[PDB]
Amino acid sequence: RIPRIYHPISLENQTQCYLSEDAANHVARVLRMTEGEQLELFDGSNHIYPAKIIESNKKSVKVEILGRELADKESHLKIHLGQVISRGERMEFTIQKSVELGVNVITPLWSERCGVKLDAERMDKKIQQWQKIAIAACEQCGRNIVPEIRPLMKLQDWCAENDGALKLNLHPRAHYSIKTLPTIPAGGVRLLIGSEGGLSAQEIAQTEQQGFTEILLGKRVLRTETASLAAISALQICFGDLGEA
Amino acid sequence: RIPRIYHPISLENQTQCYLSEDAANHVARVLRMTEGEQLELFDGSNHIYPAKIIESNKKSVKVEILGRELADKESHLKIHLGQVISRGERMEFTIQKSVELGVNVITPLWSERCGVKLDAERMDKKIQQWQKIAIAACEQCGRNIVPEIRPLMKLQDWCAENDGALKLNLHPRAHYSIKTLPTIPAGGVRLLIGSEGGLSAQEIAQTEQQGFTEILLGKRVLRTETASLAAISALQICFGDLGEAA
């Protein structure tokens, strides 16, 4: 029942500290919590810091940490989501559910055929909101590590990254199934999910050169948001922690 | 490709027909297709009927049925979703994704602490809309069997239904996981997903009476919507068509 609140900086070796401005407003003017009340803070280091409000002011809220405890709610499987941005794909939905499902990293991608705009500061503002969505997702589901929403990247450049992870992408011609995958490297997995429309003919061209491994995911055509959530769920149940308490 | 269109009645052994009002409007007004255009119809029999428009106008679309062929895009696992309604959730999203993911039947449920009223005429209208969403999802994902969205039921009554299906519910202290289930009965699976309000003592006792099998779903607490879709995906992966190779 105790509300979880994220803290922008390290809470280690901290005593009395001001909650971030935004978090302060939520705790006091949204949850309507007052001095003396407790909360569960976390600074993204996989540790929770039980604390209590000491100063509830209109300008901000100060708190006093009561200690530090390790609470690993992370999956042993690493998943890096590479999502192509579009228009009507509900990126917020994807960000939120992906975080709840244990995703470790999310890189918003852009390609020739998708359906978006062009300004960097334009998506840059959206990415900030997506990071906040991730933070709130961790506050809700219990994760004490907040996955980063990297800056806009080019599908070509993303596919060219080297992390020691198994690169995967969906395709109906594929013969491999997430359930029939032979192994998972130490770098985990890099899952690419196309935009609303889907992976263009050129996008599937770059994945082939980068040595991507195509997989099947049912006999039905899934929408973007459904495909990402389903694929992540499948990965977590087959090689992750979706089967643990 | 060729647009898919659902027809409200059996097209078996039919030579020509008029598309439904919604389909006609979509074909004539949205896609604005002329005569001679190909369409791929389906009537929920698991079959597709390639057809051609023979008359298209502002308020009427007539088509000629050219054939009938089996097109099974169904999972070999039957999933019956028992979804409790609420105020802090979107049933619309759940319906669409569940259908795409192969769910076979969905029963919307009322729970003592679900935080929702009981307007019959209102709920009936909501169900009609959810049913249309299910039809649209089938047109989109390729399914040729349309899942039924059943009338509202109380959670206790729904849990009491018996059709030989394995009854499953989510619990953090479950001594089972989808990946560890021994088998699937002939009735398939009946998956219960409650709201953020949880269940009353009398409801959890009813699940116990009905022999509901608890299952784990990870170390993180999921929102209602996330839990239903993640549970569905896991079931289809372990016992359905999502985990089938080629």
Side-chain angles (χ1 to χ4, degrees):
Chain A
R1 288 176 294 178
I2 180 172
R4 323 202 331 110
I5 300 293
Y6 174 70
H7 192 62
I9 204 165
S10 179
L11 281 174
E12 181 177 50
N13 304 321
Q14 301 278 176
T15 58
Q16 285 83 49
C17 68
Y18 269 101
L19 238 42
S20 71
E21 296 186 61
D22 286 359
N25 206 83
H26 185 258
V27 170
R29 287 161 283 293
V30 179
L31 297 173
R32 309 295 293 286
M33 293 175 63
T34 184
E35 299 169 60
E37 291 195 284
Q38 66 185 301
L39 36 67
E40 176 167 296
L41 307 179
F42 60 106
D43 55 0
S45 67
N46 221 9
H47 290 89
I48 53 173
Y49 304 70
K52 297 185 186 304
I53 299 175
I54 58 173
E55 299 179 6
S56 302
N57 317 292
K58 278 65 178 180
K59 53 162 292 183
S60 46
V61 61
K62 194 158 73 75
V63 188
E64 172 181 294
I65 305 180
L66 282 301
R68 185 181 71 146
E69 174 178 350
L70 179 77
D72 183 12
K73 292 297 194 305
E74 303 302 292
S75 162
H76 52 278
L77 173 63
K78 180 193 179 182
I79 304 177
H80 179 164
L81 171 71
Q83 178 73 63
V84 178
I85 314 305
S86 67
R87 202 63 168 291
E89 61 175 358
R90 282 274 193 170
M91 271 306 292
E92 295 181 350
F93 178 80
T94 293
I95 302 301
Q96 174 172 286
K97 280 67 192 74
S98 279
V99 177
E100 285 173 77
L101 295 175
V103 175
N104 303 80
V105 188
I106 293 179
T107 299
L109 307 175
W110 176 45
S111 61
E112 270 278 302
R113 298 197 180 75
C114 54
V116 209
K117 317 297 276 62
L118 287 167
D119 195 299
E121 172 67 341
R122 191 268 181 170
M123 208 85 278
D124 207 64
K125 233 68 164 174
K126 296 300 181 186
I127 291 177
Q128 199 171 72
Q129 293 154 180
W130 298 340
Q131 190 53 260
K132 269 64 174 179
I133 288 174
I135 292 176
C138 293
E139 282 173 346
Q140 176 274 149
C141 78
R143 293 183 67 179
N144 300 311
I145 287 181
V146 180
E148 61 153 347
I149 304 306
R150 297 209 293 169
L152 189 63
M153 246 188 110
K154 278 65 178 180
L155 190 154
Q156 182 169 59
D157 297 307
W158 187 81
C159 294
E161 281 179 349
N162 52 301
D163 241 315
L166 175 61
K167 301 174 178 177
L168 299 165
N169 75 87
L170 281 55
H171 203 301
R173 70 185 171 189
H175 67 91
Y176 274 117
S177 179
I178 289 176
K179 184 174 178 295
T180 66
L181 249 35
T183 186
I184 298 299
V189 177
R190 276 177 165 260
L191 174 71
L192 164 64
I193 301 298
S195 54
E196 209 301 73
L199 297 179
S200 62
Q202 68 170 67
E203 290 164 52
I204 308 172
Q206 289 175 172
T207 56
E208 295 180 63
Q209 69 167 182
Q210 291 308 320
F212 268 76
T213 295
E214 293 176 351
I215 50 172
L216 290 174
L217 186 54
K219 307 188 288 278
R220 295 166 293 288
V221 182
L222 304 182
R223 290 184 58 71
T224 301
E225 62 272 21
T226 308
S228 62
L229 179 154
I232 295 172
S233 179
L235 287 166
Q236 293 283 30
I237 187 76
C238 297
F239 314 102
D241 66 352
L242 256 210
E244 305 177 0
Chain B
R1 60 152 292 158
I2 303 175
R4 286 167 44 76
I5 299 297
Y6 174 74
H7 200 258
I9 191 163
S10 180
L11 293 175
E12 177 164 39
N13 290 141
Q14 293 302 313
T15 54
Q16 312 183 321
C17 82
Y18 286 86
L19 308 181
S20 68
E21 177 171 49
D22 290 348
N25 290 310
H26 175 70
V27 169
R29 185 190 180 184
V30 181
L31 303 172
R32 296 146 61 195
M33 300 181 275
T34 185
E35 295 81 2
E37 286 285 32
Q38 295 186 63
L39 295 177
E40 178 178 293
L41 279 60
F42 62 107
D43 59 8
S45 68
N46 218 196
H47 290 267
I48 53 172
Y49 301 77
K52 286 185 64 180
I53 301 182
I54 59 176
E55 190 181 62
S56 180
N57 55 58
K58 213 173 75 66
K59 301 290 288 182
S60 182
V61 180
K62 202 194 305 183
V63 305
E64 196 192 314
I65 312 302
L66 304 168
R68 183 180 199 259
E69 50 186 296
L70 186 58
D72 190 12
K73 297 295 168 57
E74 302 297 292
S75 170
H76 53 92
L77 172 67
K78 179 179 177 183
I79 296 178
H80 181 157
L81 174 64
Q83 181 61 255
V84 173
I85 61 184
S86 66
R87 60 283 172 289
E89 184 204 4
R90 48 276 192 174
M91 181 64 83
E92 288 73 43
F93 255 37
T94 299
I95 299 306
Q96 192 173 70
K97 274 63 176 183
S98 293
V99 180
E100 286 177 44
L101 288 172
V103 178
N104 299 89
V105 184
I106 295 169
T107 297
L109 312 170
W110 179 84
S111 186
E112 281 181 54
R113 56 210 304 185
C114 72
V116 182
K117 71 291 287 69
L118 188 58
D119 204 306
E121 11 280 303
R122 172 188 62 65
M123 179 55 69
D124 185 67
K125 298 289 190 178
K126 285 201 180 305
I127 297 176
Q128 300 191 192
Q129 301 188 307
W130 293 338
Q131 186 57 264
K132 295 187 165 64
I133 289 175
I135 291 174
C138 287
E139 282 169 344
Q140 176 276 132
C141 74
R143 290 181 69 172
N144 299 305
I145 275 180
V146 178
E148 174 193 0
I149 304 306
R150 300 175 73 222
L152 186 67
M153 284 183 82
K154 302 184 176 182
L155 184 157
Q156 288 194 181
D157 291 344
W158 184 81
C159 292
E161 287 192 320
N162 300 297
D163 46 22
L166 170 60
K167 298 176 184 174
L168 301 167
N169 64 299
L170 301 181
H171 199 71
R173 297 301 304 180
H175 48 298
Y176 261 120
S177 84
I178 301 167
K179 188 209 301 177
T180 63
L181 295 168
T183 184
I184 298 298
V189 170
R190 260 163 179 277
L191 177 71
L192 163 67
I193 303 287
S195 65
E196 307 296 356
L199 294 69
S200 63
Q202 206 68 193
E203 295 176 318
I204 52 179
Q206 180 55 52
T207 71
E208 294 172 352
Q209 184 196 314
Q210 294 304 319
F212 261 86
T213 295
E214 306 175 305
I215 57 177
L216 298 178
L217 244 201
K219 306 191 290 287
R220 296 161 299 279
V221 49
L222 306 168
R223 283 164 59 73
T224 309
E225 328 88 54
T226 313
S228 64
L229 308 187
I232 293 304
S233 298
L235 286 169
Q236 293 293 198
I237 275 295
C238 300
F239 300 106
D241 69 325
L242 248 65
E244 283 183 356

